[PDB]
């Protein structure tokens, strides 16, 4: 059957070329550029003593959770820099963290396959492990909360797992990737989500159906970052090949590619602003570059990090952008 | 200005900062060690005898030094996506069983390739490697009948453990493309009680001394 798959892949490529009547770059020629954009380090979150790999903004645009190799999650009050909570972790090897949309639960994980769930509204006051989600055979990569009861997880098993927090069982298993999954992104309605994989392809999945819907290709190296467009119809990706590509679910094809000759390092994190016109991506050269999602031009550079930009996120309302780095500091722009 | 609730929140944040500083100091005082090697390389027995689904952390103390060993053998994923997490490890413990020279993956070549990749990894440029040659008794018992030439065609001389394990160690060290910046510590493992722990302690002390010397400008 390996002969048929190549022919049908060629057919899909032909169809994608056919539907590509025009390109975003050509049509967006008359669109006025956003101009040169700058953001100042309004807040410098200090208190971490090890590399920071993940962070997530809360639905209120004020509380944000961060994960570092110290084995402790710090909940920061972005408006005052105060540490709302300090959550010791059973394993210091934590690479991902998630903040529940309601703000009642927080999840994290890393080299340990168990995805710890933490409750911030405990009657005891101190944060305790709500439940341990075990069953993965690979290092956990990303976490995203659909609600207080449903969470989608991606790990190095090459399969993304859907977990029911109340029972702790794997509600659904997503399969189809040929490499380790490194990133996750939930749609605005949470019905659909996409995950980046080391196979240089991004696969779209339907939570309700529990199966893949689309697969996107074009990257040359491992995909490390992925984020949905605010409208929920498109998403951007980041990969080690130092290029960021925008894909549309409806078109099932790449819309724009963001890369520069002098940028030789890969992309670790990617996110969209509230309007989606500005694309912010992290890099291994301890700086962040803002790319025009329409004109593909580098609007600005968010410099100030010392070692490496690993995680990046935008508030729910887009008021500010918080970018983590390996120097154990998170800067809010 | 800050209100009463804001002042209390600030005080709580400062207390959390104090706790974080204490935890970071405790982590700094304790030594972090990374474990690598094949499943049958004896690393399992090494971890079992040094204990005084995913990664396993083995915390133990010896002569006032708190040692925590990380076993990443259970991670069946490409290292480069997560190997960077161990950039700050003081030393890396690599376990190789000398009896694999005649095994079938030639898994000795696979172990050599893994050692080469780890040693020349850009994250471990300044990280020393503590090489553990395991199952030396079986290696010497079997070499007298099975020559070492199976794995190393270039090997010459008598086939005895004394001049065979040393040759294996030299071949392993030949993979060093950056001998100037990093160092390798090699030990021979037996059915000991604490000699391996003693060697680990000595290697950690030597690494600390070398780091201090480099900070002084020497070495």
């Amino acid at each position, epitope marked *: 059957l390996r002969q048929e798959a190549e022919q049908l892949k060629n057919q899909i490529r032909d169809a994608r070329k056919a539907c590509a009547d025009a390109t975003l770059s050509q049509i967006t020629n008359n669109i006025d550029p956003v101009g040169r954009i700058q953001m100042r380090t309004r807040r410098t979150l200090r208190g971490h003593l090890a590399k920071i790999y993940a962070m997530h903004w809360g639905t209120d645009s004020r509380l944000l959770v961060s994960a570092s190799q110290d084995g402790k999650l710090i909940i920061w009050d972005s408006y005052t820099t105060n540490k709302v909570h300090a959550i010791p972790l059973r394993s210091s090897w934590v690479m991902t963290c998630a903040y529940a949309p309601s703000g009642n639960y927080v999840a994290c994980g890393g080299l340990d396959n168990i995805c710890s769930i933490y409750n911030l509204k405990t009657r005891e006051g101190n944060v305790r492990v709500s439940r341990e989600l075990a069953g993965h055979t690979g290092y956990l990569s990303c976490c995203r909360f659909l609600d207080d009861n449903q969470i989608v997880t991606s790990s190095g098993d090459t399969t993304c797992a859907l977990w029911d927090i109340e029972t702790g069982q794997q509600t659904t298993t997503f399969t189809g990737h040929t490499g380790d999954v490194m990133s996750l992104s939930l749609a605005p309605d949470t019905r659909l989500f996409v995950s980046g994989a080391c196979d240089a392809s991004a696969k779209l999945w339907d939570v309700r159906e529990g199966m893949c819907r689309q697969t996107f290709t074009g990257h040359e190296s491992d995909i490390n970052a992925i984020c949905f467009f605010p409208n929920g119809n498109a998403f951007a990706t980041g990969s080690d090949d130092a290029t960021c590509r925008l894909f549309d679910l409806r078109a099932d094809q790449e819309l724009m590619t963001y890369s520069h000759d002098n940028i030789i390092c890969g992309i670790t994190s990617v996110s969209f602003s509230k309007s989606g016109r500005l694309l912010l991506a992290g890099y291994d050269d301890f700086n962040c570059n803002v790319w025009d999602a329409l004109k593909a031009d580098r609007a600005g550079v968010l410099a100030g990090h010392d070692n490496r930009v690993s995680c990046l996120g935008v508030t729910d309302d887009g008021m500010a952008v918080a970018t983590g780095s390996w120097d154990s500091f998170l800067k809010i722009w | 200005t800050l209100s*009463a609730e804001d002042k209390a929140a600030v005080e709580r944040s400062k207390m959390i900062d104090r706790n974080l500083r204490e935890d970071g100091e405790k982590a700094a005082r304790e030594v972090k060690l990374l474990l690598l090697g094949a499943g049958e390389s004896g690393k399992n027995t090494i971890v079992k005898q040094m204990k005084i689904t995913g990664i396993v952390e083995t915390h133990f103390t010896f002569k006032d030094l708190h040692f925590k060993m990380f076993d990443v053998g259970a991670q069946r994923s490409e290292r480069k996506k997560w190997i960077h997490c161990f950039e700050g490890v003081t030393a890396i413990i690599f376990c190789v069983a000398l009896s694999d020279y005649d095994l079938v993956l030639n898994r000795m070549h696979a172990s050599m390739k893994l050692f080469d990749s780890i040693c020349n990894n850009k994250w471990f440029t300044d990280t020393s490697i503590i090489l553990f040659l395991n199952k030396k008794d079986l290696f010497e018992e079997k070499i007298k009948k099975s020559p070492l030439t199976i794995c190393y065609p270039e090997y010459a001389g008598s086939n005895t453990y004394e001049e065979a394990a040393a040759y294996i160690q030299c071949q392993f060290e030949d993979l060093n493309k950056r001998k100037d910046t990093k160092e390798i510590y090699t030990h021979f493992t037996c059915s000991t009680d604490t000699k391996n722990v003693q060697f680990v302690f000595d290697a950690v002390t030597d690494v600390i001394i070398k780091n201090n010397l480099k900070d002084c400008g020497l070495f």
Partner: single-chain antibody, 230 residues
């Protein structure tokens, strides 16, 4: 839960140690307040100690005479009382509180102990002394303060407490907008500067009690005269 011990009869000018044992929660990270209620009057804040004993405050009426200390290993809170006056007679309540964004200070109140003896603060006003009520009838309680509680940060620091007969006061609404955990969604609070109100819709059983409005702008903390529902 919080339980208090050390009450009894004390002659005027004497000393009596008051202790509060804490269990079922991380007492170390919870701030502690002492509130006394006279047998025929409303609540009155006594002293406050922050987590770790880093900050300690006392009311002007008990400044110096009363000392508040904590002992984390035993999860016990102590209040050294000396030179007691006649007016000091009241039932002391052990209050649990934690301060962080989105927190609910004064969420839990201890059972309390009865103490009897032989013989520029913010003013909180509750003109609605009493309002006879029956099940199925909506209720509105108005509380007034001499200072605007709308802080520059945007948070309105107002707290509502309901004290059923024979039971210690329980947090009802904190910051005028957030309902305490476990409180039914029936209760609601809203208002503007210098004027606050508490509204209860479709009252029914287990609603009879005294409602106290408290301000948390700065110490010393003050409580209103109290609105009695019957």
């Amino acid at each position: 839960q919080l339980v208090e011990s050390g009450g009894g009869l004390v002659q005027p000018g004497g000393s009596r140690k008051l202790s509060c044992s804490a269990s079922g929660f991380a007492f170390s990270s919870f701030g502690m307040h002492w509130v006394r209620q006279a047998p025929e009057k409303g609540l009155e804040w006594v002293a406050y100690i922050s987590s770790g004993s880093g900050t300690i405050y006392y009311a002007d009426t008990v400044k110096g005479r009363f000392t508040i200390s904590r002992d984390d290993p035993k999860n016990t809170l102590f209040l050294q009382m000396t030179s007691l006056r006649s007016e000091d007679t009241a039932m002391y309540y052990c209050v649990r509180s934690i301060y962080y964004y989105g927190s609910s200070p004064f969420d839990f109140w201890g059972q309390g102990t009865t103490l009897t003896v032989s013989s520029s603060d913010i003013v909180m006003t509750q003109a609605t002394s009493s309002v006879p009520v029956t099940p199925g009838e909506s209720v509105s309680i108005s509380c007034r303060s001499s200072k605007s509680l709308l802080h520059s940060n945007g948070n309105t620091y107002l707290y509502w407490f309901l004290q059923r007969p024979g039971q210690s006061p329980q947090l009802l609404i904190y910051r005028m907008s957030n309902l305490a955990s476990g409180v039914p969604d029936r209760f609601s609070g809203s208002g503007s500067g210098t004027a606050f109100t508490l509204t209860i819709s479709r009252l029914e059983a287990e609603d009879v009690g005294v409602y106290y409005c408290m301000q948390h702008l700065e110490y010393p903390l003050t409580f209103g005269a109290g609105t009695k529902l019957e």
